[PDB]
Design a protein around this ligand. Structure first.
Ligand SMILES: *[C@@](O)(C(=O)NCc1nccs1)C1(NC(=O)[C@@H](COC)NC(=O)[C@H](NC(=O)C2CCC(F)(F)CC2)C2CCCCC2)CCC1
Ligand SMILES: *[C@@](O)(C(=O)NCc1nccs1)C1(NC(=O)[C@@H](COC)NC(=O)[C@H](NC(=O)C2CCC(F)(F)CC2)C2CCCCC2)CCC1
Lengths: 304, 305
């Protein structure tokens, strides 16, 4: 038993991290088969990033201008192309450590592991959720752009995030691996700020099921509610509206515990209205919203 | 910026995890060069574990009784011996991806990354602190025994924990890699329970420094205190007594922020006596005590491996 925020083992992604350097700009890249994927702003000086025209800046670059290092070993770039906000550097050597992989665009509320990297080398690994304002609450310093977020399922690594930047509130923004930015953000030093954010209701409910499975059950009230009545309360606390699709993805947890989703909703409604009364749930004094239903299922069942 | 509970990259340890199966008992082992290290109770049936005679149970076993699998490749056992609660299985093939490593015994308050594993396959990675009652608060299911905890210290993987068991309050117990159990615990189904625990004061202070480094300032005050006056308050809240050694290891964080340790102690005193003002610190509504001072330094400076 026990419930912890748990990252995927990072070794499969570690084997793909490289350093990419253009003049005075160094960042991280992702080496899969014979392509290195990295943020396109590697071709910018810091002054270029104030107002870049990427098409023009990339005309000005040759393959030689890209120094790609896998460890201390140089990989020769033999082509370069841009896809939205990502650069794809073709190299002369296919990564022998390439895992089976997919590129996926994730949805608000979904979680993933971040392997935070500097100069192509890993610092550490942690879980993040895509927030509804399309930011994540990570831990990133200068030089971390190009670090990736991912999920692993049995053999397959699904890459879903590539880090780009930090907004002035200290939260983090980036793209999928096709180079499209989550949210209304751009890869330029120009004013942009995170929108308002909601609490991820379906995740809070998943975490309450995690608590029940691990024997933390004081908040269960054995009452029930309707979806409509729950959402009227939840809206007052800036919670995301709960839909029947959310009810369905909680299905495996409702199945395992025998507690109806709407019963858990009644317990959550009372926690919102009354607070926790100096008690904790799974060691927390706030209602945690960065565990998905699948995170709970798979941690509680020991997958892979 | 940002501050997260951050595990070490796990790939160096992943390449060392194997499955060890003896009859009806399967768990995880650690394959370094030509030796696999695993909990000795792999040689026990669940019935044996009620009252095991480990020296007798070991001598009854042959090399053939151990099936060791590294992914899909079987590793033939060519010798076996026992050190405390750890079994060492000599194998015919050396692990070609053995990291530079050390077996270290950690002290209460120190943290490590746990690579949770089942059937020799890693499931996830997360940080744990060794509590003062010598348990850890992890996430472990049946089959997780033999999962290891570790730190990376420059160029060296320092293995410090091998998981054994869960106590009835849901906390977790295990050994170092020499097979000695942290705490007064034994590898047998006999009655044992976690003792009283304290909050790890030096880690709370480190985390408050992490918060200042990341731009929090609301809990800072103009006051300072002494070690003895702080400990009078800490005692009332079941905090570990702050020692001068603790003050010393907080030196680098005090240096970076310019805030003296006993100034930060006066902030912590006010937080304990008056609460957290309905506010969160680094996303927590409680005072977090599972970040060491070096955990703060390594995360805030971007140390890589
Ligand atoms: C890289 O982008 C990087 O490390 N990004 C991720 C970071 N996470 C936390 C801090 S940085 C590189 N950039 C930098 O290290 C950094 C300093 O470069 C000398 N520059 C930036 O991060 C820029 N960011 C911004 O200007 C912010 C300002 C506030 C905002 F809201 F407007 C958003 C942008 C660049 C980020 C990428 C787009 C252009 C500006 C490491 C070399 C690149
Ligand atoms: C292995 O020990 C293991 O997985 N241990 C770690 C666990 N963490 C959370 C749950 S288990 C193996 N054992 C089991 O999976 C498990 C079921 O085996 C059929 N057996 C045990 O965990 C035993 N534990 C106990 O009897 C408890 C009871 C309460 C306590 F406080 F007394 C402590 C021991 C064994 C643990 C190791 C020592 C002997 C008993 C996977 C096959 C081995």
């Amino acid at each position: 038993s026990g419930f912890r925020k748990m990252a995927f083992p990072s070794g499969k992604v570690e084997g793909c991290m490289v350093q990419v350097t253009c003049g005075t700009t160094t960042l991280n890249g992702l080496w899969l088969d014979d392509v290195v994927y990295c943020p396109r702003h590697v071709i910018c000086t810091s002054e270029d990033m104030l107002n870049p025209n990427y098409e023009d800046l990339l005309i000005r670059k040759s393959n030689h201008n890209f120094l790609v290092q896998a460890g201390n070993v140089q990989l020769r770039v033999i082509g370069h192309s841009m896809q939205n906000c990502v650069l794809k550097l073709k190299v002369d050597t296919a990564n022998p450590k390439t895992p089976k992989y997919k590129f996926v665009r994730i949805q608000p509320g979904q979680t993933f592991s971040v392997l935070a990297c500097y100069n192509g080398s890993p610092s550490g690994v942690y879980q993040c959720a895509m927030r509804h304002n399309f930011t994540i609450k990570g831990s990133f310093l200068n030089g971390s752009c190009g670090s990736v977020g991912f999920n692993i399922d049995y053999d397959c690594v699904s890459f879903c995030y590539m880090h780009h930047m930090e907004l002035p509130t200290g939260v983090h923004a980036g793209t999928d691996l096709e180079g499209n930015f989550y949210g209304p953000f751009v890869d330029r030093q120009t004013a942009q700020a995170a929108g308002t954010d909601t609490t991820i209701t379906v995740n809070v409910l998943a975490w309450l099921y995690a608590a029940v499975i691990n024997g933390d059950r004081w908040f269960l009230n054995r009452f029930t509610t309707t979806l409509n009545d729950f959402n009227l309360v939840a809206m007052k606390y800036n919670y995301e509206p709960l839909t029947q699709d959310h009810v369905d993805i909680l299905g495996p947890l409702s199945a395992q515990t025998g507690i109806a989703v709407l019963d858990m909703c009644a317990s959550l409604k009372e926690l919102l209205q009354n607070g926790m009364n100096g008690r904790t749930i799974l060691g927390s004094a706030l209602l945690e919203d960065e565990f998905t239903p699948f995170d709970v299922v798979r941690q509680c069942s020991g997958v892979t």
